[PDB]
Design a protein around this motif. Structure first.
Motif, PDB file in Angstrom:
ATOM      1  N   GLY A   1      41.696  43.587  47.834  1.00  0.00           N
ATOM      2  CA  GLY A   1      40.523  42.747  47.875  1.00  0.00           C
ATOM      3  C   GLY A   1      40.923  41.276  47.784  1.00  0.00           C
ATOM      4  O   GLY A   1      41.716  40.785  48.592  1.00  0.00           O
ATOM      5  N   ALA A   2      40.397  40.588  46.773  1.00  0.00           N
ATOM      6  CA  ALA A   2      40.616  39.147  46.610  1.00  0.00           C
ATOM      7  C   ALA A   2      42.039  38.850  46.087  1.00  0.00           C
ATOM      8  O   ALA A   2      42.563  37.758  46.269  1.00  0.00           O
ATOM      9  CB  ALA A   2      39.581  38.574  45.667  1.00  0.00           C
ATOM     10  N   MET A   3      42.646  39.843  45.441  1.00  0.00           N
ATOM     11  CA  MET A   3      43.962  39.714  44.930  1.00  0.00           C
ATOM     12  C   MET A   3      44.974  39.474  46.057  1.00  0.00           C
ATOM     13  O   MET A   3      45.087  40.274  46.956  1.00  0.00           O
ATOM     14  CB  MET A   3      44.312  41.004  44.224  1.00  0.00           C
ATOM     15  CG  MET A   3      45.502  40.920  43.384  1.00  0.00           C
ATOM     16  SD  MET A   3      45.883  42.653  42.606  1.00  0.00           S
ATOM     17  CE  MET A   3      46.678  43.705  43.984  1.00  0.00           C
ATOM     18  N   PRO A   4      45.765  38.396  45.969  1.00  0.00           N
ATOM     19  CA  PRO A   4      46.787  38.181  46.975  1.00  0.00           C
ATOM     20  C   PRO A   4      47.808  39.319  46.848  1.00  0.00           C
ATOM     21  O   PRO A   4      48.244  39.679  45.754  1.00  0.00           O
ATOM     22  CB  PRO A   4      47.392  36.832  46.560  1.00  0.00           C
ATOM     23  CG  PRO A   4      47.209  36.788  45.106  1.00  0.00           C
ATOM     24  CD  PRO A   4      45.837  37.370  44.909  1.00  0.00           C
TER      25      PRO A   4
ATOM     26  N   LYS B   1      42.411  47.593  32.443  1.00  0.00           N
ATOM     27  CA  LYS B   1      41.237  48.442  32.497  1.00  0.00           C
ATOM     28  C   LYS B   1      40.111  47.895  33.383  1.00  0.00           C
ATOM     29  O   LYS B   1      40.190  46.783  33.859  1.00  0.00           O
ATOM     30  CB  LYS B   1      40.780  48.841  31.073  1.00  0.00           C
ATOM     31  CG  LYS B   1      40.815  47.764  30.060  1.00  0.00           C
ATOM     32  CD  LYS B   1      40.401  48.251  28.676  1.00  0.00           C
ATOM     33  CE  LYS B   1      41.458  49.087  27.991  1.00  0.00           C
ATOM     34  NZ  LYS B   1      41.284  49.046  26.491  1.00  0.00           N
ATOM     35  N   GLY B   2      39.106  48.733  33.648  1.00  0.00           N
ATOM     36  CA  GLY B   2      37.946  48.369  34.470  1.00  0.00           C
ATOM     37  C   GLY B   2      38.191  48.533  35.950  1.00  0.00           C
ATOM     38  O   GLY B   2      39.203  49.102  36.342  1.00  0.00           O
ATOM     39  N   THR B   3      37.251  48.059  36.776  1.00  0.00           N
ATOM     40  CA  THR B   3      37.416  48.086  38.225  1.00  0.00           C
ATOM     41  C   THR B   3      38.306  46.894  38.559  1.00  0.00           C
ATOM     42  O   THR B   3      37.829  45.791  38.847  1.00  0.00           O
ATOM     43  CB  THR B   3      36.080  47.943  38.983  1.00  0.00           C
ATOM     44  OG1 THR B   3      35.496  46.692  38.612  1.00  0.00           O
ATOM     45  CG2 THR B   3      35.095  49.082  38.630  1.00  0.00           C
ATOM     46  N   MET B   4      39.601  47.117  38.491  1.00  0.00           N
ATOM     47  CA  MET B   4      40.563  46.087  38.748  1.00  0.00           C
ATOM     48  C   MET B   4      41.666  46.577  39.664  1.00  0.00           C
ATOM     49  O   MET B   4      41.804  47.801  39.909  1.00  0.00           O
ATOM     50  CB  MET B   4      41.202  45.671  37.435  1.00  0.00           C
ATOM     51  CG  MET B   4      41.659  44.250  37.498  1.00  0.00           C
ATOM     52  SD  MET B   4      40.140  43.173  37.035  1.00  0.00           S
ATOM     53  CE  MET B   4      40.959  43.518  34.908  1.00  0.00           C
ATOM     54  N   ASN B   5      42.380  45.634  40.270  1.00  0.00           N
ATOM     55  CA  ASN B   5      43.591  45.984  41.013  1.00  0.00           C
ATOM     56  C   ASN B   5      44.773  45.302  40.330  1.00  0.00           C
ATOM     57  O   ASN B   5      44.569  44.400  39.508  1.00  0.00           O
ATOM     58  CB  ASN B   5      43.544  45.617  42.492  1.00  0.00           C
ATOM     59  CG  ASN B   5      42.798  46.627  43.331  1.00  0.00           C
ATOM     60  OD1 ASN B   5      43.078  46.745  44.498  1.00  0.00           O
ATOM     61  ND2 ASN B   5      41.853  47.376  42.728  1.00  0.00           N
TER      62      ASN B   5
ATOM     63  N   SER C   1      38.577  36.389  39.127  1.00  0.00           N
ATOM     64  CA  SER C   1      39.703  35.978  38.326  1.00  0.00           C
ATOM     65  C   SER C   1      41.030  36.570  38.890  1.00  0.00           C
ATOM     66  O   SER C   1      41.139  37.767  39.147  1.00  0.00           O
ATOM     67  CB  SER C   1      39.455  36.350  36.855  1.00  0.00           C
ATOM     68  OG  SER C   1      38.733  35.311  36.187  1.00  0.00           O
ATOM     69  N   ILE C   2      42.006  35.704  39.113  1.00  0.00           N
ATOM     70  CA  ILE C   2      43.303  36.081  39.652  1.00  0.00           C
ATOM     71  C   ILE C   2      44.408  35.731  38.663  1.00  0.00           C
ATOM     72  O   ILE C   2      44.483  34.609  38.168  1.00  0.00           O
ATOM     73  CB  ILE C   2      43.576  35.419  40.990  1.00  0.00           C
ATOM     74  CG1 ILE C   2      42.486  35.832  41.978  1.00  0.00           C
ATOM     75  CG2 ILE C   2      44.921  35.862  41.549  1.00  0.00           C
ATOM     76  CD1 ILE C   2      42.762  35.396  43.351  1.00  0.00           C
ATOM     77  N   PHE C   3      45.230  36.740  38.368  1.00  0.00           N
ATOM     78  CA  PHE C   3      46.282  36.649  37.392  1.00  0.00           C
ATOM     79  C   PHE C   3      47.638  36.873  38.033  1.00  0.00           C
ATOM     80  O   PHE C   3      47.807  37.740  38.922  1.00  0.00           O
ATOM     81  CB  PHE C   3      46.058  37.709  36.309  1.00  0.00           C
ATOM     82  CG  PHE C   3      47.077  37.670  35.183  1.00  0.00           C
ATOM     83  CD1 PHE C   3      47.033  36.668  34.223  1.00  0.00           C
ATOM     84  CD2 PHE C   3      48.041  38.649  35.062  1.00  0.00           C
ATOM     85  CE1 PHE C   3      47.953  36.643  33.198  1.00  0.00           C
ATOM     86  CE2 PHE C   3      48.965  38.628  34.020  1.00  0.00           C
ATOM     87  CZ  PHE C   3      48.928  37.640  33.107  1.00  0.00           C
ATOM     88  N   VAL C   4      48.590  36.052  37.585  1.00  0.00           N
ATOM     89  CA  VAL C   4      49.969  36.134  38.016  1.00  0.00           C
ATOM     90  C   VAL C   4      50.899  35.948  36.799  1.00  0.00           C
ATOM     91  O   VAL C   4      50.577  35.235  35.858  1.00  0.00           O
ATOM     92  CB  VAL C   4      50.269  35.139  39.183  1.00  0.00           C
ATOM     93  CG1 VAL C   4      50.023  33.701  38.768  1.00  0.00           C
ATOM     94  CG2 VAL C   4      51.679  35.293  39.683  1.00  0.00           C
ATOM     95  N   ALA C   5      52.038  36.638  36.837  1.00  0.00           N
ATOM     96  CA  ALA C   5      53.064  36.601  35.807  1.00  0.00           C
ATOM     97  C   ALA C   5      54.446  36.848  36.456  1.00  0.00           C
ATOM     98  O   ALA C   5      54.558  37.581  37.465  1.00  0.00           O
ATOM     99  CB  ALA C   5      52.782  37.649  34.761  1.00  0.00           C
ATOM    100  N   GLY C   6      55.475  36.191  35.906  1.00  0.00           N
ATOM    101  CA  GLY C   6      56.873  36.379  36.323  1.00  0.00           C
ATOM    102  C   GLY C   6      57.851  35.533  35.488  1.00  0.00           C
ATOM    103  O   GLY C   6      57.499  35.058  34.422  1.00  0.00           O
TER     104      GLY C   6
ATOM    105  N   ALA D   1      47.200  40.609  39.485  1.00  0.00           N
ATOM    106  CA  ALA D   1      46.030  41.395  39.127  1.00  0.00           C
ATOM    107  C   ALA D   1      44.753  40.601  39.491  1.00  0.00           C
ATOM    108  O   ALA D   1      44.741  39.350  39.441  1.00  0.00           O
ATOM    109  CB  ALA D   1      46.049  41.709  37.654  1.00  0.00           C
ATOM    110  N   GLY D   2      43.709  41.331  39.906  1.00  0.00           N
ATOM    111  CA  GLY D   2      42.385  40.761  40.197  1.00  0.00           C
ATOM    112  C   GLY D   2      41.363  41.836  40.607  1.00  0.00           C
ATOM    113  O   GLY D   2      41.580  43.013  40.374  1.00  0.00           O
ATOM    114  N   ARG D   3      40.245  41.427  41.216  1.00  0.00           N
ATOM    115  CA  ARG D   3      39.208  42.361  41.733  1.00  0.00           C
ATOM    116  C   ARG D   3      39.714  43.001  43.021  1.00  0.00           C
ATOM    117  O   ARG D   3      40.173  42.285  43.924  1.00  0.00           O
ATOM    118  CB  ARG D   3      37.860  41.634  42.011  1.00  0.00           C
ATOM    119  CG  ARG D   3      36.842  41.677  40.894  1.00  0.00           C
ATOM    120  CD  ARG D   3      37.399  41.387  39.538  1.00  0.00           C
ATOM    121  NE  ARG D   3      36.430  41.762  38.501  1.00  0.00           N
TER     122      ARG D   3
END
Lengths: 320, 320
Positions: A140-143, A278-282, B293-298, A297-299
């Motif tokens: 989805g929106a997650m790169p 957790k939740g509806t996440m990717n 919301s978009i999350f990144v880690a490294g 991580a994101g939607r």
């Protein structure tokens, strides 16, 4: 003047029109002037000079568009530069091939064509002088796609392990918290709109596996659907969560492409691990040779979220 | 033929040469033929026809290069298309301005010039017809800049909260686990090489704040260093971790740019929150209007990791 055709006008396609309208000033000051010259749903279309808000009003008001001409005619005859292919599957492959064979860029959210004909379509795009963008097909929106393919381009991506289905993630998180049978948590998932009356595409791991095939191929691992070992979540019980909890684990449906594996299945994940989300996440963990391990991580779905991914691809084709 | 000058030949610059050598086949089949036509350290240089492995051997073997000509002369006179500016700060601004004023692309890992003169340098690059890339300035290998600026381009990024200093993250994670005084955990950090004899740049939050300024500006929030409220980690004790643990929290140094805030300081973070990540790691949470919301880690630093970021920028300038 960038000319856009939109094919597929259910939730995603309407999402793209809403966003193109809402963000028109910012889009134009980023990629220049644009107009949507054609829109087509599963049985009708609108082309010529019309407004996007006209098309949108008409679809909502009547369930269809203005003209009888089908999506295939708009694809093979309409005047556009880039095709946004958001078709309602339950044809897509032919819309892509025919726009590419006309020398048109294509941005898609349909997984099917990419799963069936990945290298065939990338090559067709290359043979003509255009691009096939597909950010919206996975995460989805997650790169994920632009990340694997552009950011991590000069790295050797050794593996990707992720969570590519929000519905299963929700069902498992909810089962962890409530400790109620699968049948019951599924009914909640259905009430919330996360799962359809037939939730199989989600719960049997089909959606996640389709996405895993797209990712495998994007990172250079030639793969077909038949190569993936797929296992769903329907045999995970509250009791499984209890015995796993006692040793520090939760349970998640994990999609993995590595040297050792190509699979989608439930797996024990330590509570404080990044893939315990957790939740509806990717989510996705990329293991590389030079950039270390990279996590995102994101939607993983939604109208505005999928529309965003499509727009990020349009920006990538035309930003300058 | 893409001509590259490397200015700065300490850990990062040598990392870039190692990677350019090691990944030469893959880089060339992605962006075409390239040659490094000049390399300069803090007091010498090598230009003309020479090999990168020659330059590298010479630096390691002797602590310097071949010619007396300084970095500034290579920048203003050498024959190159793109400047990789990895200068050892403890001049940089002038190397960037002078390559940009010559109409050369610039990829940098130096924060200083961007913090002092962000819009002045972006505009100079725009006025000439070139790009100023800076992925390596914040997050190390972790995509942050290309993410904020390219992937999330048509989104309104409302806030970024992250962890931008691996050393403080390590010190806090280690203090959480061992429950030993700051003085002692710092000595471990020093033994491991994470912190210098004077660890101030890390532990007083200066590094994280410099990076926060770069990020704020990248997402459209005009900001100077004096606008950031900076608080370090030297007054966090084991007892603080104990009282926080009792209520489900760990403690992290968090950098934030939002409507309400521009700060770097310690903060309570729930154990299972994505920003509760431990070790020498980086992380960033982007809150947007259309992509959720978009999350990144490294990894936030390292020789090969920083080199990777530099390469991702070179790819972005020249991939086709």
């Amino acid at each position: 003047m960038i000319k856009i055709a939109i094919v597929g006008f259910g939730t995603v396609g309407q999402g793209v029109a809403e966003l193109l309208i809402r963000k028109r000033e910012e889009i134009e000051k980023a990629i220049g002037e644009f107009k949507v010259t054609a829109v087509a749903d599963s049985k009708s279309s609108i082309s010529g000079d019309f407004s996007l808000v006209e098309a949108l009003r008409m679809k909502r008001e009547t369930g269809m568009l203005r003209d009888d001409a089908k999506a295939i005619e708009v694809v093979r005859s309409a005047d556009y530069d880039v095709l946004i292919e958001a078709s309602v599957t339950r044809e897509g492959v032919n819309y892509i091939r025919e726009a590419l064979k006309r020398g048109k860029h294509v941005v898609t959210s349909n997984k099917g064509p990419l799963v069936a004909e990945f290298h065939g379509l990338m090559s067709l795009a290359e043979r003509n002088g255009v691009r096939l963008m597909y950010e919206a097909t996975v995460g989805g929106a997650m790169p994920v796609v632009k990340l694997a393919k552009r950011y991590l381009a000069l790295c050797e991506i050794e593996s990707v392990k992720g969570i590519f289905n929000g519905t299963c993630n929700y069902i498992l998180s909810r089962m962890e918290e409530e400790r109620l049978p699968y049948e019951h948590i599924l009914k909640e998932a259905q009430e919330l709109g996360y799962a359809e009356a037939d939730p199989s595409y989600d719960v049997e791991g089909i959606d996640a596996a389709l996405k895993l095939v797209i990712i495998a191929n994007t990172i250079g691992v030639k793969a077909s659907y038949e190569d993936v070992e797929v296992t769903g979540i329907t045999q995970i019980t509250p009791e499984a969560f209890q015995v796993a909890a006692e040793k520090g684990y939760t349970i998640r449906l994990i999609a993995e492409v590595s040297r050792e594996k190509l699979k989608v299945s439930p797996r024990l994940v330590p509570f404080h691990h990044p893939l315990a989300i957790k939740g509806t996440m990717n989510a996705a963990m990329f293991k590389t040779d030079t950039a270390g391990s990279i996590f995102v991580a994101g939607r993983g779905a939604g109208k505005e979220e999928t529309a965003s991914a499509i727009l990020s691809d349009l920006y990538e084709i035309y930003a300058g």
